[PDB]
Ligand binder design. Structure first.
Ligand SMILES: O=C(O)CCC(=O)C(=O)O
Ligand SMILES: [Mn+2]
Lengths: 429, 18
């Protein structure tokens, strides 16, 4: 029973209720004028001001307008400025302000709102959980870690804080440490804990430590609608796209691209070798904590469908070749990159983020022994000048145990069943 | 940070309003 009416607002409760009804019934433009009149007669009224903000919120939804939402965001702020705001209404208004600030990508501003909310309600642990999510969204795992520690100091049983703390630990490569927190947080069943991200990383942490229990959690995640399957564990998915670990060129439909990669493979190889020899610093160590051991670096020509101009200066013929194929240069959920691994390298079993791409590998320098890739239950080898294709949303793994280096060219393509408008509008990954 | 090869980030996309 949220108490939103301060003493004066109770004296005008009738007019407020009539205005909110118009907003309930959907007469948006009618309610913005009803609440404008209430804001006129009663300029200090928090409930009138909240009505104006909610209507501005709904108007941003119909019109799909960032500018009108900015105005709503300010009005939600104005509610909190007025005298004598009831606590429930104050909390409702600033929470919704932060949420819509996150909508707009004003992640720094959302953070100030959340920090104020925690300052205003230091006993609300859920507001602290929300604050930590704000830190997580701007990539500040350090402050997010501290926040969930503080939650757990006061409410050790809070499941939301548990999983988020585990997520952070796991992201920090505190693999063993993260398992109990992720596991207990999911088992709590608290709101916000039934999230694919936590099934994803609990199972992966279990795998890395050798806990055969890892797949129990993948099944539960599949059963709760988060994973397409136990083997295919991507989280940014389009449902219905055909799903198989290995593809032939013909199945993908990108027959002309495969032809061109294989016909011109040595120019791609030679430019890659030239960068190894003369510009080796362009190869960057893979830094997503996917390397179990060894030496593994990548030289990226395209990411998120954008050409890296300086990188293409080091592979000019290759970039010229690839420009003819928007199915890969426009794959805003994939990359185009050389990859090199040296002997004694092992890539952890892992999954890519999206089922919306397929990953091509063109072999460039493949030692005759020592090198292999598993996708799902099938392990294959590369050939120099030949293309392999797999769906890297399926769990896959690579070993490099040869006596010399391994070099391939990676070309991501849109999943062939994605329509042109899907390819144009899916957010970049 | 960006989710190129994996799913390590809390969110892999960036919201830019409507
Ligand atoms: O990521 C690389 O550079 C090669 C191995 C791999 O896991 C992939 O191609 O997805
Ligand atoms: Mn991979």
């Amino acid at each position: 029973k949220p108490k939103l009416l301060n003493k004066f607002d109770k004296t005008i409760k009738a007019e407020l209720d009539a205005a909110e009804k118009l907003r309930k019934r959907g007469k948006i433009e009618e309610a913005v004028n009803a609440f404008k009149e209430l804001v006129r007669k009663y300029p200090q009224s928090p409930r009138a001001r909240y009505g104006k903000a909610q209507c501005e919120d709904d108007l941003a939804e119909k019109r799909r307008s960032n500018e009108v939402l900015r105005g709503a965001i300010e009005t939600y702020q104005e509610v909190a400025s007025l005298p004598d705001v009831p606590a429930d209404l104050l909390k409702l208004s600033l929470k919704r302000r932060s949420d819509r600030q996150q909508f707009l990508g004003h992640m720094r501003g959302s953070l100030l709102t959340l920090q104020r909310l925690v300052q205003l309600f230091p006993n609300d642990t859920s507001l602290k959980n929300d604050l930590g999510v704000g830190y997580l969204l701007i990539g500040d795992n350090d402050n997010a870690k501290k926040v969930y520690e503080e939650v757990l100091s006061v409410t050790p049983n809070d499941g939301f804080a548990k999983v988020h703390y585990g997520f952070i630990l796991k992201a920090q490569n505190k693999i063993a440490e993260s398992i109990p927190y992720l596991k207990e947080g999911i088992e709590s069943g608290d709101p916000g804990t039934d999230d694919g991200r936590f099934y994803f990383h609990l199972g992966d942490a279990m795998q890395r430590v050798g806990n055969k229990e890892a797949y129990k959690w993948y099944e539960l995640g599949h059963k709760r609608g988060h994973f397409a399957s136990v083997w295919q564990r991507s989280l940014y998915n389009v449902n219905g796209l055909k799903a198989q670990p290995w593809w032939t060129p013909k199945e993908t439909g990108y027959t002309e691209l495969v032809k061109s990669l294989e016909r011109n493979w040595k120019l791609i190889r030679d430019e890659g070798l030239a960068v190894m020899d003369k510009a080796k610093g362009l190869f960057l160590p893979e830094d997503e904590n996917l390397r179990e051991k060894g030496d593994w670096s990548q030289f990226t020509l395209w990411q998120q469908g954008r050409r890296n101009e300086n990188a293409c200066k080091g592979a000019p013929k290759t970039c010229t070749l690839l420009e003819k194929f928007p199915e890969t240069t426009g794959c805003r959920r994939g990359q185009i990159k050389y990859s090199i691994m040296h002997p004694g390298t092992h890539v952890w079993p892992h999954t890519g983020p999206t089922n919306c791409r397929l990953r091509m590998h063109l072999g460039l320098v493949i030692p005759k022994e020592g090198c292999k890739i598993r996708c799902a239950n099938e392990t294959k080898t590369w050939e120099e000048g030949k293309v392999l294709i797999f769906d890297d949303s399926f769990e896959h793994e690579v070993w490099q145990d040869a006596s010399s280096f391994w070099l391939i060219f990676i070309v991501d393509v849109w999943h062939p069943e994605l329509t042109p408008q899907q390819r144009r509008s899916l957010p970049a990954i | 940070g960006k989710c190129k090869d994996g799913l390590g980030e809390y969110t892999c996309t960036s919201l830019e309003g409507f």
